[PDB]
Symmetry: D3
Subunit: 169 residues, 6 copies
């Protein structure tokens, strides 16, 4: 059993993330998906709580017919010590074989701990990113079209738009 | 629409826990399952890491016919302040309506925060017996779902607990 | 200006504590009162939150005609490092000259940091202590008579008795 | 019976803050005053310790005619999780009914937790001006209650901030 | 370069520890010595601070002619997650190859992380242990004969006996 | 016995630091050397772990013939409360008499706690500083000539150049 790992803030989870995830699922048996910076919420850059993001991911992966036997969803708080972050991830996750990240720090930390590391198989453009999603939530643009419907429903339930607009005053 | 919450150490996850979970799923649309004391591992009482327990639960709920749309699995570290623990849980979980616990402290903490609280529908198969059988070469496997046994083989759980029990 | 310091869990604040406080106020201009183990609540030994204990002290000292200019009330969480606890107290409090404690560890920590340390001027018996108060709350004894009335009112408002009884099941 | 809450860094406590407080006390029976960012000291922006600020507030509210039965003064450290901060405040404070803040984050956090929230009744005297005058030998004293000036003399606040502003 | 690691509380550092250290130095080029439970001080079981123990070890190893090029002395606080403790040690130390410990937990944690683990080459009897040292400090026994002279000098300077006696009241 | 204290990040330890250390050793019997920001690693500004820096200092001071009896090397994590940092240092170190620092904050914190504070006896120019070392590591300049040979050897073993280059992508 070959297990990959992916880590991202997912503020919020959007179609870009999902596309990356599906691409990774072509080359691993199971994917561990870590929601990074789980401690950060209620800012313009990081509006949603760990729990809200768990909800988004859990619903999105279920709505798209990905079998539950092929993924794990795990919130992970940042820590002060970079040299310990890999150990922190390992404690919170099933054993894994390969890490997917385009981030140099994430790459290097996992590589120094002896893991295989590769870039994600797909890169999405800025117009489909979290920054664009949040900007559209703020400016009454079409944020919904950038997200799976199951994520839009989470955002409606938790009043995500009202939250982010209030925080931008 | 109606979401329940359950919290336990699950050291390890056994057929008892699964029976309770299925029973709760007859009363709620979705169940949030929190793995408590996520920080504790590598002792006789708490042998498995948070990650290992996430793995056990994820596999066990998938192997049994439970749709993924009906549960969430969330590791939760203990904190020093009891008066903050409910807030900690809330931050880490989807919104929920009702808590299932037989533990007086858990009940009272959630009750003071305005949640409906009730005992689990079923009382049972115990973690103490599972761990004792792992230590004494008893039939621990029969107390667990097969998917959990497979996790324990992969992570060398028995060897771990036996080593930790030395002098 | 001569400033004393006193530290206790005050679970809850009872007439014994108050008697000690009044005795200390005969020999200092101002008394800093620290509520220790501020992080502990919702147990048989430590039922009340920091905030609840602040309330108890603030009300009790006001009801008994002690002028506000003569005291400070400060919640203090325990820390893991004993060697740092005095520094932690100092950061959270006004400057002070003398510490009142009968506890050997508290005495020694403050003495090693160069403070004058003395035992409290009065010692109350076990039958008037927090242990007796909590035991009476549990067993339907006369807990009210061990407390100032203003503290009884705090306990009624926060449902302290119901809390402690539930926790003892 | 009706309890308000106010939160600010109070670096230092000045006549502005006191005016706001007196104005709030016309609308509530009791006011909980939280000294925020209690962990920050010894910078140009945040020169004073939690303890020093507790001292300033305690003395200033006593010197002005405010009865002790009408307020509580509580230092509160910042925490990493915004979603926990309200729970943190609640643990450290008496129960309260209404929050006074002009800060959008503070407003929204308390509002999501079910509290009534409103802007302070008065907008003003600023901490930035006080600190600038301490640094540049201006008339900082006139911006503060006399009891606060006395705290700052005792703790050598001016000398501290001047030393910290060096190269 | 073959590097060993040893970890102990060293409350205080005594001749037994030193004997073990010298035996280990016959088998490795360099020895990393970690002072565990660095956060604990001012109790009967753990009287000395991290700093005081660093002082004891530094002085003792220098007085006994062990070259400075052959050891490292590193204080290490305990952490709540056993699954992170090895990562915590690794962050605070030079790279190492082999761990010396008789403790089952320490053995298993390091072993799971891929390190070679072995028992210490020598075991000292109870009569020469920290427990006996501390007991003799309390009861006016001959504690000095159980410690290197350089450690005795540290304990005199920091008033260690006076401390532990006060804490036992 | 007169004991000084020095604190710096030492990212990495270079000849400038060593020169300052030797100058201080003309004025004190013993020097406590604290490695500050011990929690920070794996960034352009702070590339090396606490352990790696302990290794650099231990090797450099031993290669240059400074007797082991004249120094202590101690990693110190930053903390959020400036008013506690001196207490944190004191817990982790032997007792000391005088602090050497050019940093206003460090000076004032120690000074408020009653310590004698002075500037270091020597100031090295920017061209010999950590910033210049790290810049040369990144840009294939002569970084080696700015460090003691023992430190170069540490950096080769831990692949420090490869690390910092990867982190700069
Ligand atoms: N010491 C520690 O605690 C530590 C150390 C290292 C990393 N971490 C954490 O690990 C998490 C992940 O690190 P990160 O740097 O990747 O943070 P991140 O928040 O996930 O940022 C990565 C950036 O790249 C974008 N991105 C990710 N995958 C992409 C793809 N396939 N194509 C295009 N753009 C892509 C993201 O866009 P979107 O805005 O669309 O998501 C985001 O703008 C973070 O929470 C970080 O804080 C923690
Ligand atoms: N401040 C804080 O951090 C805080 C505050 C409150 C609670 N917590 C945490 O929350 C968790 C919940 O506490 P808990 O005591 O309920 O969990 P627990 O540690 O799993 O203990 C419950 C005990 O009752 C058993 N049990 C649970 N459900 C049962 C059922 N339906 N029938 C029969 N037996 C049942 C368990 O058996 P098994 O061994 O077989 O599972 C276990 O022995 C703990 O991890 C605790 O640390 C933390
Ligand atoms: N590292 C750290 O964080 C650290 C280090 C040292 C101390 N502390 C904290 O400092 C606080 C105070 O320490 P403590 O040992 O005094 O704890 P404590 O909870 O205040 O206990 C002292 C005991 O003596 C009793 N007592 C106090 N004053 C008395 C008097 N005048 N006459 C008779 N009985 C009296 C108290 O009785 P009642 O039950 O009636 O109150 C209690 O039973 C605690 O919260 C402790 O945790 C923390
Ligand atoms: N997660 C967390 O830990 C968390 C989350 C939210 C907030 N907080 C904390 O809570 C505190 C509250 O935030 P805050 O931004 O309101 O406090 P703040 O840091 O005091 O900032 C408010 C600013 O507005 C000014 N101000 C306040 N009330 C005013 C009034 N009635 N009229 C005119 N100006 C007024 C203050 O001036 P002066 O300088 O003169 O006082 C200050 O410049 C902060 O310490 C923050 O760190 C923490
Ligand atoms: N999660 C975590 O933070 C974590 C996990 C594992 C371990 N640790 C820490 O690691 C450190 C070391 O663990 P430990 O279990 O070895 O603790 P320890 O307290 O340093 O040693 C345990 C006992 O063994 C004795 N001993 C050690 N070496 C001996 C020898 N060669 N011959 C005879 N007796 C010997 C010690 O004697 P003396 O009294 O003479 O010293 C002590 O009584 C501790 O600080 C522990 O807290 C931390
Ligand atoms: N609350 C807290 O946790 C707290 C409070 C205060 C300070 N600290 C910590 O204390 C440590 C030391 O503070 P610092 O401000 O001195 O930081 P630093 O980063 O160690 O030094 C500051 C700068 O001064 C340079 N420098 C040092 N000594 C010099 C000399 N003799 N001649 C010329 N340049 C010299 C350093 O050069 P190089 O680049 O060559 O090294 C560096 O560029 C830091 O780790 C800091 O984080 C922590």
């Amino acid at each position: 059993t070959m297990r990959g790992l992916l880590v991202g803030r997912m503020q919020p989870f959007h179609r870009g993330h999902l596309q990356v995830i599906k691409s990774i699922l072509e080359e691993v048996d199971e994917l561990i998906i870590c929601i990074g910076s789980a401690q950060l919420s209620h800012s313009i850059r990081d509006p949603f709580t760990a729990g809200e993001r768990v909800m988004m991911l859990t619903k999105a992966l279920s709505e798209n017919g990905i079998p539950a036997s092929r993924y794990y969803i795990i919130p992970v708080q940042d820590i002060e010590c970079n040299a310990l972050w890999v150990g922190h991830i390992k404690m919170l996750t099933p054993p894994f074989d390969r890490v997917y990240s385009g981030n140099p720090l994430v790459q290097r930390l996992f590589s120094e701990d002896g893991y295989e590391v590769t870039a994600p198989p797909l890169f999405y453009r800025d117009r489909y990113s979290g920054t664009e999603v949040r900007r559209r939530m703020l400016d009454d643009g079409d944020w919904r079209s950038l997200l799976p419907e199951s994520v839009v429903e989470v955002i409606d339930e938790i009043n995500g738009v009202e939250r982010i607009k209030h925080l931008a005053k």
